[PDB]
Amino acid sequence: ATVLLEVPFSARGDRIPDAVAELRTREPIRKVRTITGAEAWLVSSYALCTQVLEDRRFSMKETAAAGAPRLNALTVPPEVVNNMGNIADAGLRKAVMKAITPKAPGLEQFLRDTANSLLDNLITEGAPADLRNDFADPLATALHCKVLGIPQEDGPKLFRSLSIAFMSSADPIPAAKINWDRDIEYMAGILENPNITTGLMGELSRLRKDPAYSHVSDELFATIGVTFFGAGVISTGSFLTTALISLIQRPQLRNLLHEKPELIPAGVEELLRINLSFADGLPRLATADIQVGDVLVRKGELVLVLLEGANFDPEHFPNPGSIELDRPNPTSHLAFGRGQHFCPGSALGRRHAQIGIEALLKKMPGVDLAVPIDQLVWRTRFQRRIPERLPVLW
Ligand code: HEM
Ligand SMILES: Nc1n[nH]c(-c2ccc(O)cc2O)c1-c1ccc(O)cc1
Ligand SMILES: Nc1n[nH]c(-c2ccc(O)cc2O)c1-c1ccc(O)cc1
Secondary structure, three states: OOOOOEOOOOOOOOOOOHHHHHHHHHOOEEEEEOOOOOEEEEEOOHHHHHHHHOOOOEEOHHHHOOOOOOOOOOOOOHHHHHHHHHHHHOOOHHHHHHHOOOOOOOHHHHHHHHHHHHHHHHHHHOOOEEOHHHHHHHHHHHHHHHHHOOOHHHHHHHHOOHHHHOEOOOOOOHHHHHHHHHHHHHHHHHHOOOOOOOHHHHHHHHHHOOHHHOOOOHHHHHHHHHHHHHHHHHHHHHHHHHHHHHHHOOHHHHHHHHHOHHHHHHHHHHHHHOOOOEOOOEEEEEOOOEEEOOEEEOOOOEEEEOHHHHHOOOOOOOOOOOOOOOOOOOOOOOOOOOHHHOOOOHHHHHHHHHHHHHHHHHHOOOOEEOOOHHHOOEOOOEOEOOEOOOEEEO
16 A cells, blocks of 8 residues: 655656656546645646636635645745735736836846856856856846846845745745745835835835825735745746756757857747746645546645646647757747736746856857766755756856
8 A cells, every 4th residue: 555646756857757747648637645735636738737727716816725725835924825916906917017027128238247247257266167056046136136126235135035935845934934024124125215216116116105006005015026026036046047957968959059049039938848947736726616637626625737747748749858949839838827827927037048048158158067967956845946056067
């Protein structure tokens, strides 16, 4: 005898476990146990994944209900699991979206300049360099301080909350509350700071004083700042880092994108498709009894949407493990989710990767890992898959 299959299978972000393809072929929805001891339904085919994500009766918000089967412990207040809902209800969705587009004036040039500066600093210091801690993460942090309108010097201290805030823990985390409360107090100060007049925080600070938003809570405005900084920085930093590993281990691609950088957007889209950055399925709570494949999911049950299950499905993406720049369905992957909760930062995330990769390939065309790949240390019990260091030479 053995215990029910447990998730996640592996914290390694450089290879997909063979088990995923066996699950998808034999039982594309099947029961698993999460780190809390709860049972869940693990969905691993493209067809089923999309079904769940496009059916709002599979609820994000209700994942936070008391007594529900849980993937992990909350690290935020329960109302924040409905953060986009709350933003929408307060009439802030359009404003938020306008603030976090990469099309803002000078923002792409800021990204380019910062990428180049970080890489020049590595080149000056000499190999080996750490491309996570000294490239991808500072580039993500700088980008988000600019997007928010907050001082660049405040980036590092906000960033130091993230190794805890994005944990995927069986139990509540005392440090996550200490850092949340501190970060909310910082964003509440920024809304009262007259020097802050640009970016998402400058726009929220104006809307706060506009009569049409007078009944929006000060808690919501501060929470938008904290959440969009942390979600953006973790997601862009982790995605770039793991895409950089995928590129380093494909020199033929690395060399084609060096030689024809116009193919960088198509390459980033494929890097998005194969990316293993999300460590867990996306959770949803069934709010009705709903047939999914061969399983009738019951009201109150937890469903986990495995992005890599969808994104490696050979029925949808033939030769799924290959990076193919000419696919007919290139953006139809689920790297940014699907449906009501589709990533609001998708365009920003794509541009951060594109510019980071362009900059790196121009400055370090001979980039390679400086350790054998098996020596990378994968962060455990986290909402992302990430190596703790990414040592490279060039
Ligand atoms: C490559 C970069 C990124 C990836 C791969 C990514 C991926 C995702 C995915 C998969 C979801 C859907 C979660 C779900 O349905 O349960 C999502 C949601 C979210 N993303 Fe991103 N994201 C990235 C960048 C960003 C950026 C740059 C921001 C903000 C500056 C951001 C903010 C958020 C927020 C706030 C949500 C929650 C939306 C909701 O609840 O409706 N993301 N992201
Ligand atoms: N899923 C999450 N885990 N941790 C967070 C989070 C974000 C910022 C932060 O400072 C603390 C966090 O716990 C989130 C979060 C939750 C909702 C949201 O719209 C964006 C991010
Ligand atoms: N308001 C709630 N408090 N706790 C729950 C809950 C959720 C899932 C479960 O399996 C058991 C519960 O009591 C709910 C809830 C919320 C929505 C729903 O469709 C079913 C139950």
